[PDB]
Write a protein that binds this ligand. Structure first.
Ligand SMILES: C[C@@H](O)[C@H]1C(=O)N2C(C(=O)O)=C(S[C@@H]3CN[C@H](C(N)=O)C3)[C@H](C)[C@H]12
Length: 244
C-alpha cells in the first residue's frame, strides 16, 4: 500500500525530529533492512552498554552464579539513580537497568569465565579486556547495529549456545510493551562514559500469529535528551512499517 520511499522518509523524520543521528535495522526472516537518517552507522562499532545485560544474564544463569528468584541486596551506598537503592532480582534489574546488580553478576562470573563465554557466543568484537565490571560501558567491547539485531534474532529463536531454559528465563525479563496484540521484548542501552554517547534499543516484536521481528535502534545521545526517545522512535518506526 505505502511506497518504500514514504516508509524511508517517515522513519528518517522520526530521527530528524529528535535532533539526533541514528539507524534502526529490522530483520524479517533472513532479510536485513536499514532505516533512519544516518544509514552508515549500520556497520560501525559502539560499546554495547546495558544491551550487554542480556548476555550477562544468560552467562550468569547458565553457570549458576544466580537464580531468577534471588534477591540482590542493596549495599546501602548512595546510588546515582534512587530507583537503584533497593533489593532486586535480575529481572527487576533488567527493567531498571541497574548496573550495580549487573556488576555483581559480572564479578560472580569472573573475568576468566566472562572472556571464554563471550568468545564462545562470538558477541561483537569479543574483547572484554582486564576489567570484568565495566567492559560493556567504556570498552573495549564493541559491536555493530547489524550484529545487535543478529544477536536479538538468535535469542528470539533460542539459537544461542545456552540451555533453552536459560534463554526463556532471560526472555521473560525483557517484556517492555504490549501494543495491538503484539509483544515488544527489548533492552535499552545508554553509554554515558563514551564520547560521543551511544543509545541502543535491541529486541524483537512477537506478533499475534507467532512470527518474531527483530530490530536494533542505535543513535547518538546528546546532553539532556530523555532516554524514552529511544523507545518512541522505535515504536513509531515499527508502527510505520505495520510490524505493530
Ligand atoms: C532513561 C534513563 O533515566 C535511564 C535508563 O533507562 N538508562 C540507562 C539505560 O538505558 O541503559 C541507564 S544506564 C547507566 C547510565 N550511567 C552508566 C554509565 N557508566 O554509562 C550506565 C541510565 C540509568 C538511563
Amino acid at each position: 500500500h505505502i511506497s518504500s520511499q514514504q516508509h524511508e522518509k517517515a522513519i528518517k523524520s522520526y530521527f530528524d525530529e529528535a535532533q539526533t543521528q541514528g539507524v534502526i535495522i529490522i530483520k524479517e526472516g533472513k532479510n536485513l533492512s536499514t532505516y533512519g537518517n544516518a544509514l552508515a552507522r549500520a556497520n560501525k562499532e559502539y560499546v554495547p552498554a546495558s544491551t550487554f545485560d542480556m548476555l550477562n544474564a544468560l552467562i550468569g544463569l547458565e553457570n549458576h552464579k544466580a537464580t531468577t528468584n534471588e534477591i540482590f541486596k542493596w549495599d546501602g551506598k548512595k546510588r546515582t539513580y534512587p530507583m537503584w537503592e533497593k533489593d532486586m532480582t535480575l529481572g527487576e534489574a533488567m527493567a531498571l537497568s541497574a548496573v550495580p546488580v549487573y556488576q555483581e553478576l559480572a564479578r560472580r562470573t569472573g573475568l576468566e569465565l566472562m572472556q571464554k563465554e563471550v568468545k564462545r557466543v562470538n558477541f561483537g568484537n569479543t574483547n572484554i579486556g582486564t576489567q570484568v565490571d565495566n567492559f560493556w560501558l567504556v570498552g573495549p567491547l564493541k559491536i555493530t547495529p547489524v550484529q545487535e539485531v543478529n544477536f536479538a534474532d538468535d535469542l528470539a529463536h533460542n539459537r544461542l549456545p545456552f540451555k533453552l531454559e536459560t534463554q526463556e528465563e532471560v526472555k521473560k525479563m525483557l517484556l517492555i510493551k504490549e501494543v495491538n496484540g503484539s509483544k515488544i521484548y527489548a533492552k535499552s542501552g545508554w553509554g554515558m562514559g563514551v564520547t560521543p554517547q551511544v543509545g541502543w534499543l535491541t529486541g524483537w516484536v512477537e506478533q499475534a500469529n507467532g512470527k518474531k521481528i527483530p530490530f536494533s535502534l542505535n543513535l547518538e545521545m546528546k546532553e539532556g535528551m530523555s532516554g524514552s526517545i529511544r523507545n518512541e522512535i522505535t515504536y513509531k518506526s515499527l508502527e510505520n512499517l505495520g510490524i505493530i
